C-alpha cells in the first residue's frame, strides 16, 4: 500500500489478506 | 409657587420625583437646593421624573427644586484644545478656566439631506490596514468594534497622533482637530491616555471630554453629545474635526439605568425602545458639509465592545446598522501576532475608494484582491504539501502581504510611506523572503527611504499615483536593499 | 378642538381633551413650536386622555401645551407634483424646493383593497431586464425581496427599474427610505438626478422620494413606509397605473415598529419583537397588490439578522414575497451586470400555469445548464477543459454563453459608460436563451453575448469582431 | 431624632421619621437589640418614610420598634491600631481582643479621587509566578484583577500573591473578606500570626483585616468592601505609604446589591442584575487606586457567574483594571495550575518601552505558538497527526511543553499538589521560555516541563523519567 | 497522603494525554508510561456499593498501583486482582493492616512488607 | 422543561422514548441510556441480569462516543477494535426493537412477547460475539434471539 492514511479501507483490506511495501 | 419651583416627593437611585414645577420643559435642567443639577426626563401628570447629576445624599424629601432658566449647552471653541473637560466642559485637568467665548446646545438636529456633499476627502489614520483596506473619509462614521482588550482604543489613539503631520503644516484644508470622549472608563486609564497624547505632542489639537465610571449616569449620557457639539463648531466654521466616542456600550448602559429607574419599559437586554434613537441621533451629526455651508466636516469613530464577538447583539446591531462601515478586531488575530488585530475580510467602508488618494487606491486594490484569493486558499496552508504552483503563490503572496499589514503601536505612517511598503509586496519583491523576517525588513527599508529617498517620497505624493519614474526608482532601491539584507 | 399635554415620557406624549376625543391613528398638531410636531393617537387611556407617539423630538414640551386635533390621520400630498420631490413622514418637503402644490391630499392609514377589489389573475411585470424576466420574474402587484447590501449595483438596479417601468408600462415609482441614512439619502437623490430618473428642470421625473431618516423617533421610521405607500396608491387608484414601490429597508420597518411597541409598554414577543409583528406587517403589505383599476408592485430590500432565515423578522417578511432578486458580490467580480445570481433568485410565479409552458421550460433549461456547469468546474480544475466528453464540451460553451447573455447594459448608466442601454422585450428574452440552449449559436465566439440587448445584437457583436 | 420601623421584608427595612429625616447613606441604630444593629439609609420613599438596607439579620424586629439616626454614615476606626486586628462591616472588632483604640474614624462612604489626583507611574511588580510575570505582569500601585469561575484557583493564587509579595513588603497590607468562606478567614488569620505579619504581642503587625463572609446578610456584604477600602484609604493618604489591598471576592459586592434590588423597587436589568450595576461599581472601584498622595497596589478576586465572562458583573469589571489574570476551568481540568489562560490575560505594561524588547518578544512568541496550536487542535484531532508538516508538528510539540512550563507548584498549594513550592525569578522565566521557543529542548519529554519551577528542574525531571 | 499526594494532577494529565494520543502513532517512553499508569489507576478507583472500605485497605490497593507493581498486568484483570489481594491481606496480614491503621502511616518497615506481598502475590495470580 | 424534569423523581422506573430513535425505525423507541430503574441491582434481579444489562449499556455508550468520528470520517478510519464495538452495538440496538401486537399495522409483523430469560440470553450471546457473523438486519424487529437466526438464514 503506502504511508498515508485517510484512503478508507485501502490499508485494512490488504492487512485482512495478511516483508511489506508501504 | 409650583409653576417655577417644586418639592422632592421621593429620591433614590439617582431619581427624584418632584411635585410641582408645572412649567418645566421636557429635558430641561433644574437645580436642587444643595446645588446639584437635574434633568427633567419624565413629565408625569402629578410629578416630574428628575435625573440626578451627583450623589443622592444631598437631596432629601421636601427639598426645593428650581427652574433657573437653564439651557443644556457646553462651552465651544479652539480654547478647549489642549484641555481635559468633563461632560459639561468643566475643566478637570487643573489648568483653570476654559477661556471660551462661544457656547453650543448639546441636543441638536444633524444637518439634513440638502446641506451636504458626498464624502470625498481622505481621513488618514496612518494605520496601513485601515488606510489601504478600510479607508475612512472626512464626514463618514466608521465603527471600531471588537471584544474587550482587542486594540480598539489604540486604533483611535494612533489616528489622533497621525494628524500632527497635517496640523503642523501650512495646508488648512488638510488639518484635523480631535475630540476623544471617554465614557465609563476609569480616571487612571484616561490619565495614561492623555499622557500618551501629550508625549506625542498631540494634545495641542485634541479635546478630551471624559465622563468616568464614578460620574453619575446622566453625565455619561450627555458626554458624547457635548463632545459632538464641540466638534460641530469646527464642522460649521469651515473646519474638520474627528470625534472618538469611547465607548457607546457604556453610554447605552448609563441610559438603560436611567430608563429602568424611571420605570420606562424594558426591551431586549432591558434596553428601552429609544436606544437606537439615542445612538442614531448622535452619529447622524457626523457629516460632510457643502461649500455653500462652509465645506467643513465632523468624522465619527464610535467604539462598541462586543461580548464573545457577538456582532448580532442589540447595541452592536444598532451601531453597525447606523455607521457607514466597521473596523472589526479579533482576539485570535491579536495573539496570532496580527496586530492591529483587524479582520480584513470582515471590516468594511461603504465610502471605499472615494476616500483614498490615487496612490493608495492603486496598490490597495491589488493587495485587496490578492489577500482575498489568499483567503479562498489559506486553509490549504498548513495541510498543503502537494499544491500547484499557482495556489502555492497565492499563499506565499498572502502570507507576505499579511506581514506588511502588521504595524507597531504609536507610530502611524505617512500615506506615501504606506504605498512604498505595500509596493514591496504587491510587486512580489518579498515573495522569496522569509515570513518571520518581513517586519524587520520593513523597518530597515522604510528608515532607508525616509533617510535617503525623501525626494522619491516627495514624488509619490505630488504625482497622485506612482509614475514610471517612481516605478523605476523603487524597482532598484528594493532589489539592491533586499540583496543587502539577505547577504 | 384642543387638548392639553399631561405627560411627556421620551417620544410618548399623553394629551387630555375636554370634549370630543380624537380616534386612534388621528394626527395631532402641537402648538407653540418652531417646527411641526405631529402626535399620532395610539391609545385611549380612559379619563379623556389619549396616548400618542411623537413624529419628531419632544425636547421642550411643557405640561399644558395646547394640542389641536386635525380630525384625520396623517394626511400627505399626493399626485404628479410629488415626482422628483423628497418628502418626510408627515408630507413636508425636505429637498428645500418649496411647497408640494397638489390638488389632493391623502391619509397614510388606509385599509387594504377588499376581497372583491382583487384581480384573480397572475400577471408578469416585465422589467425589460433579461435575468429577472426569464428566471425570477416579478408578479404584477407582488412583493420582491432584494438581497445584497452594498456595492452590488443596488442603486443602479433600482434606478433602471424605475426607468423601465415608466417606459414599458407607463407607471411611476416611489422610494420609501425607512431608516434612510442622511448621507446615503443625499447620495441616492443626486445619483437619481444624474441618471435622469429625477429631473429638476422640467416635470419629467419618474420617482417620488419619501425619507424616514435614522435620527428620527421610532414612530416616524415606522410610518414612512405608509407615507410612500399612499403616494403610490394615488397612481394606482386615481390614474390606473402599474406602480413600482421601493421599500428600503423592510427590516427597519419591523424594528421601528418593535421600538414603538416597546415605548407603548407592550410585552415583547419571541426574540423581543412586538407582539403585533405579523399584523403590523400585514396591514402595510396587503395594500401592495393588483386591484381592477391598477397595481402596486414593491421592491423591498431585506436584511437578515444574524444570518438567520428563521428569525421572526425575515420569517414574517417572507410570507409576503413572491420573488427574490439576489445581488451577489461573486457575480459582480466576474463582471456580470446586473450582479444577479441566477440560481439564488427565485419567483413564486415561475410556474407554467402562470407564465406559460414555454417560458417555464426555457427558464428550467437555463437553470439546469448553469447548475450542471457548476458540477464540471472541479473537473475543469482537475483534468482541464479538453478532457470533457463532446456533449460536455457543449454544456460548458453554452453555459458560459448563457451566463453572459444574462448580463445587459442599463440605460440608467449610459452616462458613465458610453454604451446604449437595453430594455429587452419578454419574448426576445425567451427567444435568445431558447435559441442558445438549442445550440443555434455554438459557433459564435463566447464574448459576443456579453453586455448585449436582444439576440440580434449578439450576432451583430460577433460580425464586428474582425 | 427618633424613628419607627414600619415594614420589614428580608434585609429591607422601611422606617418612618416624624421630624428630621435622615439623608441617604446615613447609618441608623436599631434600639432594643442585644448586638448593635445598623440600618443604612438607601431611599426616600415619600411620606416621611425612608428605605434602608440592614447590616445584620432582621429576625426579631417588630413594627413600631425604635430607630435612632446617628447623623452620619457608617464610620469605622482607621489608623495604626487596625493593624493585626480583625474588623466587620461596621468597624466592630471580631477577634475577641478588646476595643480598637484609634484617635480618629472615617466614613466608609467617600468621593473618589479626582482626575488631577491620578498617577501615570508604572513599573513591574515581579511575582515569582512564571505565567503572570511573563505574559501579563503586575505593576506597582496598579489595579490587578483575578477572573475565575467557581473553584478554578482565585483564592489560592491570591494567597500565593500574599505569600510571595506581602511578607517582603515595607508598607502596610489590607485584606478584606468580601462574601467568601469564613473558614478561609480563620485560615488566613492563623497563617499570618504564624508568618508574623500579624503579631498578637507587640505592635509590629503589617496587615489589617476586615471580614463579612457569605454567612452574612446582603447589606453586610454590600458594604464590607468599602470598609476594607476605607482602611486602605487612610493608609494611602494620612501616611502616604505603599498600601497593599487584597480583596476576595469583589463580585460579592455586586451580587449583594442584586439580592436586595427588587425589594428596593427596581425593574431588573439583563441577567437579573440591578440596573445600577456599572455605576454602583464605578463609585466604588474609583476609590481603589494609586493617587499622588500615595500608592495602593490592589489585587481583586473576581467571580465569573456560570463561567461566563460576558456576565454583566465580571464583564463590567475588566475596565477598572491595569492587569487581568483570567483563570479557566478547561485549563484547570487538565491539571495545569495556576489555571491561567495565556490567550486572555493582559497587562497595561506588556510593552517593550517598559518591560524591554527581550521580555516582550518572548511573551508574544509564547502566545503565538499557543494560539497557532489552539487553531490546529480541533483540526488534527480528527484529521490525524501524521499529515502535518515537520515544522508544524514541531510547533505542536513546543506549545504543549510551554503550556506545561506555564504550570508551577505553589507554596500555598502544597496540600493540593504533593510538590514543593517554587518561586521563579523574572529573568529565569524569560530565559526558560526563550529556550523552549528556540528548540533547545525538543528532545526532552513533554511531562518533564510539568509542575516544576525553573528550566533546570525540567531538565533534572527529564533524567528521573529516563528511569 | 503517602500514596495519593500527586495522583489527582497525574490523572488529569493522564486523561488529556489519552485524548491527544488518540490518533495512535509512535509515542515516547514518557507518555506510554503515563497511559499505562492511568488506565490501571483508573480501574483501581472503580468500586461497588454498600461496602465502604477501611482506610488501611484503601491504602494497600492504591499502593499497588502508584508504586507501579501492576504496570505489566492486563488492565481488565485489575478488578479481579484487587479483590484477591484484599481478601489475602485481610486474613494473612492483619498485623500489617493493624499497623498502618494505628500508625496512620506506611513506615519504612510497612513499605518493605507491602512490596514483598504484592510482588509475589501478583506473580502467583498471573501463573 | 419543568413539567417532565419535575416528574422524574416521582418514578420507580423510567422509559424515556427518543424521537431520533423512532425516526431510525427502532420501536419501541426506547433510549437505552436514559431509562433507569431502581431495581437495577444485582441483589434484586440477580448478577447475571445485572452483568448483561451493564454490558449492553457499556457497548452502547462506547459506540455513542465513537459516533462523531464516524460522522466525519465514517466506518473505515476506526481501528479493528472500534469496528467490533460498532457492529455489536448496532446489532444490539436492533435487537432492542420489538413488534407490538398493538402496532402490527405499522410494522407488518405479528407481535412478539419475549420471556425474561430469553431476553437475557439473547443480549448475552450478542455480547460474547456469538453472532458477529450475522448481518444487522436480522436483529431488527424480532422477538427471541432464535428468530434473528432464522431471519439470517432466510436472507440467504
Ligand atoms: N498595533 C498594536 N501592536 C501591538 N500591541 C497593540 C497594538 N495596538 C494595541 N496594542 C496593545 O493591546 C492592548 C489593548 O489595546 P486597547 O487599545 O486597550 O484595545 P481595547 O480593545 O480598546 N481594550 P479595553 O478598552 O481595555 O477593553 C494594549 O496593551 C495595547 O498596548
Ligand atoms: N495553584 C494551584 N495548585 C494546585 N491546585 C490548585 C491551585 N489552585 C487551585 N487549586 C485547586 O482548585 C481548588 C479551588 O481553588 P480556589 O483558589 O478556592 O478557587 P476559587 O477561589 O477560584 O473558587 C483548590 O482547593 C485546589 O484543589
Ligand atoms: Mg479601549
Ligand atoms: Mg475563592
Which candidate, C275, C210, C230, places its Cα nearest to that of C112?
A: C230
* Residue C182 in grid coordinates: 442622511
Classify domain D350-467 by CATH architecture: Orthogonal Bundle (1.10)
Beta carbons within 8 Å of C390's beta carbon, 6+ residues apart? none
* Residue D254 in grid coordinates: 455586586
Contact D65, D3 (CB under 8 A): no
Task: Say what the resolution is, in angstroms.
Answer: 2.7
- Strand partners for D199: none
Angle at D366 between CA D364 and CA D371, to 5 degrees: 90
Kindly report the CATH class assigned to F40-156. Answer: mainly alpha
Q: How many Cβ pairs within 8 Å bridge chains B and D?
A: 169
Report the C-alpha gap between C443 and C312 in whole angstroms: 51
Contact B216, B52 (CB under 8 A): yes
Whole-number CA gyration radius for chain A: 8
Residue of A nearest to F75 (CA): A8
| End-to-end CA separation in angstroms for chain A | 5
Report the C-alpha gap between D441 and D462 in whole angstroms: 10
Domain boundaries, chain D: 1-73, 74-349, 350-467
Tell me which chains share at least 3 CB pairs under 8 Å with chain A: D, F
Contact B185, B305 (CB under 8 A): no
Whole-number CA gyration radius for chain B: 25
* Residue D390 in grid coordinates: 515537520
Beta strand C66-73 with C37-46: parallel, antiparallel or unpaired? unpaired
Experimental technique of record: X-ray
Contact D23, D85 (CB under 8 A): no
Beta carbons within 8 Å of C66's beta carbon, 6+ residues apart? C2, C3, C4, C30, C31, C32
- Which position has the grid cell 514591496? B424
Report the C-alpha gap between B362 and B465 in whole angstroms: 7
Contact list in F for residue D382 (CB cut-off 8 A) is 69, 72-73
Q: For atom 25 of ligand 1, which residue has the closest CA?
A: B149
Q: Is C181 a catalytic residue?
A: yes
CA torsion C230-C234-C240-C243 (nearest 10°) is -50
Report the C-alpha gap between F65 and E40 in whole angstroms: 21
Report the C-alpha gap between B444 and B455 in whole angstroms: 18
Contact B70, B28 (CB under 8 A): yes
Report the C-alpha gap between D176 and D449 in whole angstroms: 36
Consult the annotation and say whether E49 binds a ligand. Answer: yes
- Which position has the grid cell 477577634? D95
Consult the annotation and say whether D153 binds a ligand. Answer: yes
Residue of D nearest to F69 (CA): D382
C104: helix, strand or coil:
strand
- CATH number, domain of B385, equals 1.20.150.20
Tell me which chains share at least 3 CB pairs under 8 Å with chain E: D
- My answer on whether B258 and B390 are in the same domain is no
Beta carbons within 8 Å of C180's beta carbon, 6+ residues apart? C211, C212, C213, C214, C248
Contact C240, C294 (CB under 8 A): yes
Quick one: chain D helix, strand, coil %, rounded to 5? 40, 20, 40
Catalytic residue among C75, C130, C143, C154: C154
Mutate to test the pocket of ligand 1, among D351, D357, D364 (most ligand atoms within 8 A of CB): D351
- In Å, the largest CA–CA distance within chain C is 88
- My answer on whether B137 and B267 are in the same domain is yes
Contact D152, D309 (CB under 8 A): no
CB contact under 8 A, A12 and F80: yes
Element (H, E) at F89: helix F80-95
Mutation test of the interface with chain F: which of A6, A12, A17, choosing the one with the most F Cβ atoms within 10 A?
A12
Helix and strand totals (H; E) in chain A = 1, 0
Q: Is C140 a catalytic residue?
A: no
b/e map C407-429, b = 16+ CB within 10 Å: bbbbbbbeeeeeeebbbbebebb
Pocket around ligand 1 at a 6 A CB cut-off:
B 146, 148-154, 339-340, 407, 409; D 350-351
The CA–CA distances, whole Å, from F144 to F115, F116, F138, F147, F150 equal 8, 10, 12, 6, 10
Report the C-alpha gap between D376 and E23 in whole angstroms: 14
Which candidate, D134, D144, D180, D135, places its Cα nearest to that of D318?
A: D144
Q: How many domains does chain E have?
A: 1
Residue B340: how many CB atoms within 10 A of its CB?
A: 24
Torsional sign, CA B371, B373, B377, B381: negative
Whole-number CA gyration radius for chain C: 25
Looking at domain D74-349, which of 3.90.950.20, 3.40.225.10, 3.40.50.300, 3.90.1150.10 is its CATH number? 3.40.50.300
Which candidate, D255, D256, D230, D264, places its Cα nearest to that of D245?
A: D230
The CA–CA distances, whole Å, from C257 to B77, C45, C224, C263 equal 40, 20, 11, 10
| End-to-end CA separation in angstroms for chain D | 81
Overall fold of domain C350-466: 1.10.1140
- My answer on whether B78 and B63 are in the same domain is no
DSSP B111: P
Nearest ligand to the CA of D148 is 2
Beta strand C37-46 with C49-54: parallel, antiparallel or unpaired? antiparallel
DSSP B124: -
* Residue B103 in grid coordinates: 457656547
CB contact under 8 A, A5 and D383: no
The residue range of the domain holding B66 is 1-70
D222-225, Cβ contacts within 8 angstroms, sequence gap of 24 or more: D222/D53, D222/D253, D222/D256, D222/D257, D222/D260, D223/D40, D223/D55, D223/D74, D223/D89, D223/D108, D224/D88, D224/D89, D224/D176, D224/D177, D224/D178, D224/D179, D225/D176, D225/D178, D225/D250, D225/D252, D225/D253, D225/D284
* DSSP per-residue string spanning D142-188: -EEEEEE-TTSSHHHHHHHHIIIIITT-SSEEEEEEESS-HHHHHHH
Torsional sign, CA E100, E102, E104, E109: negative
How many CA atoms are closer than 13 Å to the CA of D283, on its beta-carbon side? 18
Q: What CATH number belongs to C1-73?
A: 2.40.10.170
Residue of F nearest to A11 (CA): F76
E42-47, Cβ contacts within 8 angstroms, sequence gap of 24 or more: E42/E11, E43/E75, E43/E76, E43/E78, E43/E79, E44/E70, E44/E78, E44/E82, E46/E79
Q: For residue C191, how far is the Cα from the chain centroid?
A: 17
The CA–CA distances, whole Å, from B27 to B44, B283, C57, F75 equal 13, 20, 11, 70
How would you write B179-192 as a 3-class SS string? Answer: EEEEECCCHHHHHH
* Residue D119 in grid coordinates: 498617577
Consult the annotation and say whether E2 binds a ligand. Answer: no
Q: Cis bond leading into C70, ω under 30°? A: no
Residue B120: how many CB atoms within 10 A of its CB?
A: 13
The CA–CA distances, whole Å, from B130 to B326, B355, B397 equal 10, 11, 19
Which residues precede gaps in chain B, with C-N > 2.5 A? none
How would you write chain E as a 3-class SS string? Answer: CCCCCCHHHHHHHHHHHHHHCCCCCCCCHHHHHHHHHHHHHHHHCCCCCCCCCCHHHHHHHHHHHHCCCCCCCCHHHHHHHHHHHHHHHHHHCHHHHHHHHHHCCCCHHHHHHHHHHHHHHHHHHCC
Cα-to-centroid distance, B153 and ligand 3 (Å): 4
CB contact under 8 A, C259 and B322: no
Report the C-alpha gap between C408 and C405 in whole angstroms: 7
Contact D182, D357 (CB under 8 A): no
Angle at D111 between CA D227 and CA D27, to 5 degrees: 50
Report the C-alpha gap between D194 and C461 in whole angstroms: 98
Which candidate, D190, D224, D226, places its Cα nearest to that of D207?
A: D190
B39: helix, strand or coil:
strand
Report the C-alpha gap between C326 and C146 in whole angstroms: 6
* DSSP per-residue string spanning F126-151: HHTTTTTTS-GGGTTT-SSHHHHHHH
Which candidate, F91, F144, F94, F140, places its Cα nearest to that of F115?
A: F144
Contact C46, C60 (CB under 8 A): no
Angle at D60 between CA D55 and CA D66, to 5 degrees: 75
D60 touches chain E (CB under 8 A): no
Which candidate, B9, B8, B13, places its Cα nearest to that of B261?
A: B13
Sheet of C207-213, strands arranged across: C86-87, C207-213, C173-180, C242-248, C295-301, C143-147, C323-326
Amino acid at each position: 500500500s503506502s504511508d498515508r492514511g485517510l484512503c478508507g479501507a485501502i490499508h485494512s483490506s490488504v492487512a485482512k489478506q495478511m516483508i511489506g511495501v508501504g | 409657587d409650583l409653576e417655577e419651583t417644586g418639592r422632592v416627593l421621593s429620591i433614590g437611585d439617582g431619581i427624584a420625583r418632584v411635585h410641582g414645577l408645572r412649567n418645566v420643559q421636557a429635558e430641561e435642567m433644574v437645580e436642587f437646593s444643595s446645588g446639584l443639577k437635574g434633568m427633567s426626563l419624565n413629565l408625569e401628570p402629578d410629578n416630574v421624573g428628575v435625573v440626578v447629576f451627583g450623589n443622592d445624599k444631598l437631596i432629601k424629601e421636601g427639598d426645593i427644586v428650581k427652574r433657573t432658566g437653564a439651557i443644556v449647552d457646553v462651552p465651544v471653541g479652539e480654547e478647549l484644545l489642549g484641555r481635559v473637560v468633563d461632560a459639561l466642559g468643566n475643566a478637570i485637568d487643573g489648568k483653570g478656566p476654559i477661556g471660551s467665548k462661544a457656547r453650543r446646545r448639546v441636543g441638536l438636529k444633524a444637518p439634513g439631506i440638502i446641506p451636504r456633499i458626498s464624502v470625498r476627502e481622505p481621513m488618514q489614520t496612518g494605520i496601513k490596514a485601515v488606510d489601504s483596506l478600510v479607508p475612512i473619509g472626512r464626514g463618514q462614521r466608521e465603527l471600531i468594534i471588537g471584544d474587550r482588550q482587542t486594540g480598539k482604543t489604540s486604533i483611535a489613539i494612533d489616528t489622533i497622533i497621525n494628524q500632527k503631520r497635517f496640523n503642523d503644516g501650512t495646508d488648512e484644508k488638510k488639518k484635523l482637530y480631535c475630540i476623544y470622549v471617554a465614557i465609563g472608563q476609569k480616571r487612571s486609564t484616561v490619565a495614561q491616555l492623555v499622557k500618551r497624547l501629550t508625549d506625542a505632542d498631540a494634545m495641542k489639537y485634541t479635546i478630551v471630554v471624559s465622563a468616568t465610571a464614578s460620574d453619575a449616569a446622566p453625565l455619561q449620557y450627555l458626554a458624547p453629545y457635548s463632545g459632538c457639539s464641540m466638534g460641530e463648531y469646527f464642522r460649521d466654521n469651515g473646519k474638520h474635526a474627528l470625534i472618538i466616542y469611547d465607548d457607546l456600550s457604556k453610554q447605552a448602559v448609563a441610559y438603560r439605568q436611567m430608563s429602568l429607574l424611571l420605570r420606562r419599559p424594558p426591551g431586549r437586554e432591558a434596553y428601552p425602545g429609544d436606544v437606537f434613537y439615542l445612538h442614531s441621533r448622535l452619529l447622524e451629526r457626523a457629516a460632510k458639509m457643502n461649500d455653500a455651508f462652509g465645506g467643513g466636516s465632523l468624522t465619527a469613530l464610535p467604539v462598541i465592545e462586543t461580548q464573545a464577538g457577538d456582532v448580532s447583539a442589540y447595541i452592536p446591531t444598532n451601531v453597525i446598522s447606523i455607521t457607514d462601515g466597521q473596523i472589526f478586531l479579533e482576539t485570535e488575530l491579536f495573539y496570532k501576532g496580527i496586530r492591529p488585530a483587524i479582520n480584513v475580510g470582515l471590516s468594511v467602508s461603504r465610502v471605499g475608494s472615494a476616500a483614498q488618494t490615487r496612490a493608495m487606491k492603486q496598490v490597495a486594490g491589488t493587495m485587496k484582491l490578492e489577500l482575498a484569493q489568499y483567503r479562498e486558499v489559506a486553509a490549504f496552508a498548513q495541510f498543503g504539501s502537494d499544491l500547484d504552483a499557482a495556489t502555492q503563490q497565492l499563499l506565499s503572496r498572502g502570507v507576505r502581504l499579511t506581514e506588511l499589514l502588521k504595524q507597531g503601536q504609536y507610530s502611524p505612517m505617512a500615506i506615501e510611506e504606506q504605498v512604498a511598503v505595500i509596493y514591496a509586496g504587491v510587486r512580489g519583491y518579498l515573495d522569496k523572503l522569509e515570513p518571520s523576517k518581513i517586519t524587520k525588513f520593513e523597518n530597515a527599508f522604510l528608515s532607508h527611504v525616509i533617510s535617503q529617498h525623501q525626494a522619491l517620497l516627495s514624488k509619490i505624493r505630488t504625482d497622485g499615483k506612482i509614475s514610471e519614474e517612481s516605478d523605476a526608482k523603487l524597482k532598484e532601491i528594493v532589489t539592491n536593499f533586499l540583496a543587502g539584507f539577505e547577504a | 378642538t384642543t387638548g392639553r399635554i399631561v405627560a411627556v415620557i421620551g417620544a410618548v406624549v399623553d394629551v387630555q381633551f375636554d370634549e370630543g376625543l380624537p380616534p386612534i391613528l388621528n394626527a395631532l398638531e402641537v402648538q407653540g413650536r418652531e417646527t411641526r410636531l405631529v402626535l399620532e393617537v395610539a391609545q385611549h387611556l380612559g379619563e379623556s386622555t389619549v396616548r400618542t407617539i411623537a413624529m419628531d423630538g419632544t425636547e421642550g414640551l411643557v405640561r399644558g401645551q395646547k394640542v389641536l386635533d386635525s380630525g384625520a390621520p396623517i394626511r400627505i400630498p399626493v399626485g404628479p407634483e410629488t415626482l422628483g420631490r423628497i418628502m418626510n413622514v408627515i408630507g413636508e418637503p425636505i429637498d428645500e424646493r418649496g411647497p408640494i402644490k397638489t390638488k389632493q391630499f391623502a391619509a397614510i392609514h388606509a385599509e387594504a383593497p377588499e376581497f372583491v377589489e382583487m384581480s384573480v389573475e397572475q400577471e408578469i411585470l416585465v422589467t425589460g431586464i433579461k435575468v429577472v424576466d426569464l428566471l425570477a420574474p416579478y408578479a404584477k402587484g407582488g412583493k420582491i425581496g432584494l438581497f445584497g447590501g452594498a456595492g452590488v449595483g443596488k442603486t443602479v438596479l433600482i434606478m433602471e427599474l424605475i426607468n423601465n417601468v415608466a417606459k414599458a408600462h407607463g407607471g411611476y415609482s416611489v422610494f420609501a427610505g425607512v431608516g434612510e441614512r442622511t448621507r446615503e439619502g443625499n447620495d441616492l437623490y443626486h445619483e437619481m438626478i444624474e441618471s435622469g430618473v429625477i429631473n429638476l428642470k422640467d416635470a419629467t421625473s419618474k420617482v417620488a422620494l419619501v425619507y424616514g431618516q435614522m435620527n428620527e423617533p421610532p414612530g416616524a421610521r415606522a410610518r414612512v413606509a405608509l407615507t410612500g405607500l399612499t403616494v403610490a396608491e394615488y397612481f394606482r387608484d386615481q390614474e390606473g397605473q402599474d406602480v413600482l414601490l421601493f421599500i428600503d429597508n423592510i427590516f427597519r420597518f419591523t424594528q421601528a415598529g418593535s421600538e414603538v411597541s416597546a415605548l407603548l409598554g407592550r410585552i415583547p414577543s419571541a426574540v423581543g419583537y412586538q407582539p403585533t409583528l405579523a399584523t403590523d406587517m400585514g396591514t402595510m403589505q396587503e395594500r401592495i397588490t393588483t386591484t381592477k383599476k391598477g397595481s402596486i408592485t414593491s421592491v423591498q430590500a431585506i436584511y437578515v439578522p444574524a444570518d438567520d432565515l428563521t428569525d421572526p423578522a425575515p420569517a414574517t417578511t417572507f410570507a409576503h414575497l413572491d420573488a427574490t432578486t439576489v445581488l451577489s458580490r461573486a457575480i459582480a467580480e466576474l463582471g456580470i451586470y446586473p450582479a444577479v445570481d441566477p440560481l439564488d433568485s427565485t419567483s413564486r410565479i415561475m410556474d407554467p400555469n402562470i407564465v406559460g409552458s414555454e417560458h417555464y421550460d426555457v427558464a428550467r433549461g437555463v437553470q439546469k445548464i448553469l447548475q450542471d456547469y457548476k458540477s464540471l468546474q472541479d473537473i475543469i480544475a482537475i483534468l482541464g477543459m479538453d478532457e470533457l466528453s463532446e456533449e460536455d464540451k457543449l454544456t460548458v460553451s453554452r453555459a458560459r454563453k448563457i451566463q453572459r447573455f444574462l448580463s445587459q447594459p442599463f440605460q440608467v448608466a449610459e452616462v458613465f459608460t458610453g454604451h446604449l442601454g437595453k430594455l429587452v422585450p419578454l419574448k426576445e428574452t425567451i427567444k435568445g436563451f431558447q435559441q442558445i440552449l438549442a445550440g443555434e449559436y455554438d459557433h459564435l465566439p463566447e464574448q459576443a453575448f456579453y453586455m448585449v440587448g436582444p439576440i440580434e445584437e449578439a450576432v451583430a457583436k460577433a460580425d464586428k469582431l474582425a
